[PDB]
Design a protein around this nucleic acid. Structure first.
Lengths: 104, 42, 205, 103, 74, 65
RNA sequence: AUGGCACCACAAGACGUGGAGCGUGCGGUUUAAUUUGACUCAACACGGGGAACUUUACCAGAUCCGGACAGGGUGAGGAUUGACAGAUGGAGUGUUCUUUCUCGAUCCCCUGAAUGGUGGUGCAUGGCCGCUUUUGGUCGGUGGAGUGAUUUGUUUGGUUG
RNA sequence: AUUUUGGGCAACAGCAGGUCUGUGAUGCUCCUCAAUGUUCUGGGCGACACGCGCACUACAAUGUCAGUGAGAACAAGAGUCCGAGCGGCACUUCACAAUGUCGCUCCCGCUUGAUCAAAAGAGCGGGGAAACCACGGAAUCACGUAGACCCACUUGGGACCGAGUAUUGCAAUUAUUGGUCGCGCAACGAGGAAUGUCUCGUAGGCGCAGCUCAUCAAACUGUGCCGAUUACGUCCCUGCC
C-alpha cells in the first residue's frame, strides 16, 4: 500500500502511564492493517531542583533536591492514515503527551 | 542583578527560586514538587 | 505553546493551581481533590468533595460559579471545560476533607483535643488505618504549645510512608495567634489496585 | 477608591460579569510588550477594575475567591438585585443562576 | 571511541578475548577454545570485570566525594 | 500633603457662549473663542488662546492663530 | 567501673590550610545608607545575599494613594482630571504658579473609619526549617512488681553492626 | 559477596535554636499620605588601621614557553499574549506627522555555513522547537612526541596598570564583562604556634556540565578525565551508646 510512516511518539511524566497508552492504541490500531516496526524509546530527560531549605538565620544552611524524569517512547508504523484516524478516536489521559506525525 | 524577577507566586526578588520559568518562593517550591512531579534524587 | 519539558510542567502546575484554588473554595464542601482529564474539546474536571451534592446543586451551586470562573481565568473561550462531581464515598477517608472539617471544628470553637480525638475515631471508623493530628500553635495569654493526636499506626519509616499517609495543614487565627491543625490520615493498605504488597508483606499461601 | 474614571467601567464589569454570572482573572498590571491588553477577562483595565471592584466587594454583595493571585468573582444574591437595578432590566437577573447546561 | 583511555584498553582486550572465543566456538572446538581462554584468563587484565566507576556522584553540601568544606571549628 | 491641583477659576458660569436674537437666522454658533479640531474632546472645546497658540488643555493640541 | 562503638575518634598515614596573594563572607572600621538575622560544633559563599537602580529593608529629595465604608457637610450657577507656553520643578509631573483653555464629579472637605506598609517583635505564634543526632531507639497494653515515684517487660549469657 | 552499591526514607521526646528575609500562616504591637505607603529619582549596603572565616591562586621543572596529541562525559536551548522589528492594510495627510488595524517575522531564545579584518569584532544565507536528528559523527582536562630555558626569579609570578577596540545595561559613573598590546620582577621560593578535612577506578588532582545570569562566580549542583599509602586495627586520644 501507500504506507505512512506514522510516528507516534509518546513522552510522559512517568514511564508508567504511557506504556499503557502506547500499547493499547497500537493493539487497537493494529488489528490489522496498522503495521508497526517496534517501539523505540528516545533518552529519558531529567529535571533537577536543589533548594536552599531552612531560614536558618542560624542553624545549618543545608540544601534539598527534587527530580522529574520524563520518559520518551516512539513507535513507527507504516500504516493507513484513515485507519490511523479511525483508531485515533481515543480521549487519553494526561501525563502522557502523545504526538502523532506522518513523515517517511 | 536583583530587581526584575518579581516572583509570580510572590512579587518577590528575594526568597524566589529562579529556576525554569517558575517564580515561586523557596518555600513555595518546597510545597509544590508533588503536583509537578519532582521527587528526591539526592 | 510550551516545549516538551514545559508542557509537562504546565500540566503539573495546572494540577497544583487548581488543587489549591479548590481547597480554598471548597472549604465548606470538604474538598478532597480533583481529577483532570484533558479531553478532546473539553477539559474535564471530576470533583472529589465529600459534599458533592452540595457542590453540584442547582441555580448557582458551585460548579456554575466555577465553570465561569475557571474559563475566564484560564483564558478560555467558554465551555471547553466540564466539571463532573465525584461522589468520594465514605467521606472520613481524607486528610484534606478531615482537615477541612477539623478546621471547621476549630472554627466551630470545639474543644480541640476532644474534637480531634472524636474525629479521629470517626476517621478510623470511616476506615482510616491511622490518623495523626497535631495541634501546634499557642496557649497562655499568648505562649506557644503543641500536642499530638494519633490513632491507628502511622508509617514513620520508608517509601510506604509516602504511599500510605495523606496530610493536610491548616492555620486558625483564634483569640490571636496561629494554630496549626496538621493532619495525617493513613488509609488501610487494602489499596488494591493501589498496591498492597508493602515492604514487609511476606504472607504464606 | 477615588477615580475620575467610573460608570462606564462600572457598567462594563457589572454587565459582563452578570451575563456570564462570573468573571475570573489573573491579578495583573499589564506587561508582555503590552498595549491592547487592558487586563484579561475584560477589555477594560486592571487599575480601574481592581479599584472599582474593591468598592463592590467591600460592602458585601460579590464574592472574590482566592488562590495564587487570582480572583474568582462570583456575583451574590444581593448583587443580582442591585446590579439588575443598576443594569436596568427585569427582576430575575441571570448571573450565576442560569444552570440549564450548568452555567 | 573512549577515555577511559586505558579503560578503553582494558575494554579492547576484553572484547578481543570475547572475539577469540566466539569465533572459536564456531571455528574451532573446545580444547583450543578452552586453552586460549585459559591462557588468557591466566594473565587477564579484566576480561569480565568493571572498574566500576571513573568519577563519582558528588556529595552536595560539601560539593565533593568523601571529604568536606572545612570545619572552621571556632 | 496639603494641595488642590492648579486650575483656572470657574466660578460664575460658562461665559464662552454668546448667542443672541440677531444671531438667530444669521449665526448658530456664537462663543467666546476659537475652536478645536483634532481633540478627542472634539468640537466643543474652544482652545486656550495663549501666545498666538491655541492649546488644548486636555487633548494637547498645538494650534496657532 | 564494664562492654562497645565512630576518619568533626583515633590509628597508617594521606592532602591541604594556616604564612602569601587575590575573592567573597565575616568581624571591625564610616555614613545620610550602610535593612538586618544568625556567632561552639549547629553564625562566619548562610540568609536561595552572584546587591549598579531595582533589588532593599536604610538616607536624601520628590510626587503619587492603591485614604476600603460610613456619617455629615461642601461640590457641578462647578469640585475636578488635564494643560500649553513659560514661572517653579531631579524631572515638557501643572508639583506649584502666572496666564488661560481644556476637562468634568468619578469631587473635596472634614468628622468617623480605613488601609498599602520590606512598619516591630520568631520568647506572642503556626508553618517551615536547623539542632538534638545520627545517635538505635519508643511505646503502650494487659499481665507482673513496688506504698509511691517507679518498675518490669525491654535483660544476665550468647549472637548481631 | 558486605545490612553487596550510593542514596532516599525513616522512632520518640527534645531544643522561647533559627524561622518578621518567602509566605496571599499569622498575635499583640506600629505608620497610612504634609506615612517609613507607593512610585520616582538618587544613593547605599561594595566605603580600608585592622581581627578573622572560608575559598581560590602563586611561589614553579615535578615547571614555565612553542608547538604537536584521531581523548566525550554529564547535561543545556525556539513562552504567551491583535501599533516590538518587519510588512501589508486602514484612515488621517498639499507634504510630514498621526492614529488605528491587520498580518508577518512575534517585543523572533540556542544557533550553523563563512567573508572582510592584528585582533577581539563586524555578517548574506542557512539550520536546530529538549533536538540522541542544526549548535553533537565534532570537540571533553591534566596525555603522549618534536622544539626555547645549559635552573638562575629564569622573569617563577602576576597581583599592578596604561593608553587602545568590542560587547551588557535605561544607567556602570562604588571600573557590568570581554578585548588588545605593552606591561610588571608587588606579595608570593610552598607558610609559624597552631591547624582542616580524609581509608576505593577511589584520596586526589584534574578538568567540564548545570543555574544565579541584562551583564557577571573562585559559590551553588552535578559531569567527566586521570588516578593511589596503610588503616583495616585499635580503643588509646578524642567523642557517642
Amino acid at each position: 500500500q501507500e504506507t505512512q510512516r506514522v510516528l507516534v511518539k509518546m513522552t510522559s511524566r512517568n514511564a508508567k502511564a504511557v506504556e499503557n497508552v502506547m500499547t493499547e492504541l497500537l493493539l487497537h490500531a493494529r488489528n490489522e492493517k496498522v503495521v508497526l516496526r517496534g517501539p523505540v524509546r528516545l533518552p529519558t530527560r531529567t529535571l533537577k531542583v536543589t533548594t536552599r531549605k531552612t531560614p536558618c538565620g542560624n542553624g545549618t544552611n543545608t540544601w534539598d533536591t527534587y527530580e522529574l524524569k520524563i520518559y520518551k517512547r516512539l513507535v513507527e508504523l507504516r500504516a493507513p492514515t484513515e485507519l490511523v484516524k479511525k483508531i485515533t478516536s481515543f480521549p487519553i489521559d494526561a501525563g502522557v503527551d502523545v504526538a502523532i506525525t506522518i513523515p517517511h | 542583578g536583583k530587581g526584575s524577577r518579581h516572583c509570580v507566586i510572590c512579587s518577590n526578588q528575594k526568597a524566589v527560586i529562579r529556576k525554569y520559568e517558575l517564580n515561586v518562593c523557596r518555600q513555595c517550591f518546597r510545597e509544590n514538587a508533588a503536583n509537578i512531579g519532582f521527587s528526591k534524587l539526592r | 505553546p510550551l516545549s516538551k519539558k514545559r508542557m509537562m510542567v504546565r500540566d503539573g502546575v495546572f494540577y497544583a493551581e487548581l488543587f489549591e484554588f479548590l481547597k480554598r473554595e471548597l472549604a465548606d464542601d470538604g474538598f478532597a481533590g480533583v481529577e483532570h482529564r484533558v479531553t478532546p474539546t473539553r477539559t474535564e474536571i471530576v470533583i472529589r468533595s465529600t459534599k458533592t451534592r452540595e457542590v453540584l446543586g442547582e441555580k448557582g451551586r458551585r460548579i456554575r460559579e466555577l465553570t465561569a470562573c475557571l474559563q475566564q481565568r484560564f483564558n478560555y473561550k467558554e465551555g471547553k471545560l466540564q466539571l463532573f462531581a465525584e461522589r468520594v464515598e465514605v467521606r472520613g477517608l481524607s486528610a484534606m476533607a478531615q482537615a477541612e472539617s477539623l478546621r471547621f471544628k476549630l472554627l466551630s470553637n470545639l474543644q480541640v483535643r476532644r474534637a480531634a480525638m472524636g474525629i479521629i475515631r470517626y476517621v478510623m471508623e470511616s476506615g482510616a488505618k491511622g490518623c495523626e493530628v497535631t495541634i501546634g500553635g499557642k496557649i497562655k495569654g499568648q505562649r506557644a504549645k503543641s500536642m499530638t493526636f494519633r490513632d491507628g499506626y502511622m508509617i514513620k519509616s520508608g517509601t510506604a510512608h509516602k504511599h500510605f499517609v495523606d496530610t493536610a495543614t491548616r492555620h486558625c487565627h483564634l483569640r490571636a495567634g496561629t494554630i496549626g491543625v496538621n493532619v495525617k490520615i493513613m488509609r488501610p493498605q487494602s489499596m488494591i489496585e493501589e498496591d498492597e504488597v508493602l515492604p514487609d508483606v511476606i504472607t504464606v499461601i | 477608591m477615588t477615580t475620575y474614571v467610573p460608570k462606564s467601567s462600572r457598567d462594563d464589569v457589572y454587565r459582563f460579569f452578570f451575563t456570564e454570572g462570573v468573571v475570573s482573572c489573573k491579578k495583573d498590571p499589564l506587561g508582555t510588550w503590552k498595549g491592547t491588553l487592558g487586563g484579561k477577562t475584560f477589555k477594560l483595565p486592571t487599575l480601574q477594575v481592581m479599584q472599582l471592584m474593591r468598592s463592590l466587594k467591600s460592602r458585601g454583595l460579590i464574592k472574590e475567591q482566592f488562590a495564587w493571585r487570582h480572583f474568582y468573582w462570583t456575583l451574590n444574591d444581593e448583587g443580582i438585585n442591585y446590579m439588575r437595578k443598576y443594569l436596568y432590566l427585569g427582576a430575575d437577573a441571570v448571573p450565576n443562576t442560569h444552570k440549564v447546561d450548568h452555567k | 571511541r573512549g577515555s577511559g583511555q586505558v579503560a578503553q584498553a582494558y575494554a579492547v582486550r576484553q572484547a578481543i578475548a570475547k572475539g577469540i572465543i566466539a569465533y572459536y566456538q564456531k571455528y574451532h572446538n573446545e580444547i583450543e577454545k578452552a586453552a586460549l581462554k585459559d591462557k588468557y584468563l591466566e594473565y587477564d587484565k579484566f576480561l569480565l570485570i568493571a572498574d566500576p566507576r571513573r568519577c563519582e556522584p558528588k556529595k552536595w553540601g560539601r560539593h565533593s566525594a568523601r571529604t568536606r568544606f572545612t570545619k572552621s571549628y571556632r | 500633603k496639603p494641595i488642590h491641583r492648579h486650575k483656572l477659576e470657574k466660578m460664575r458660569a460658562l461665559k464662552y457662549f454668546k448667542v443672541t436674537e440677531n444671531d438667530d437666522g444669521s449665526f448658530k454658533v456664537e462663543r467666546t473663542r476659537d475652536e478645536c479640531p483634532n481633540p478627542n474632546c472634539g468640537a466643543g472645546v474652544f482652545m486656550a488662546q495663549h501666545k498666538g497658540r491655541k492649546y488644548c488643555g486636555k487633548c494637547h493640541l498645538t494650534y496657532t492663530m
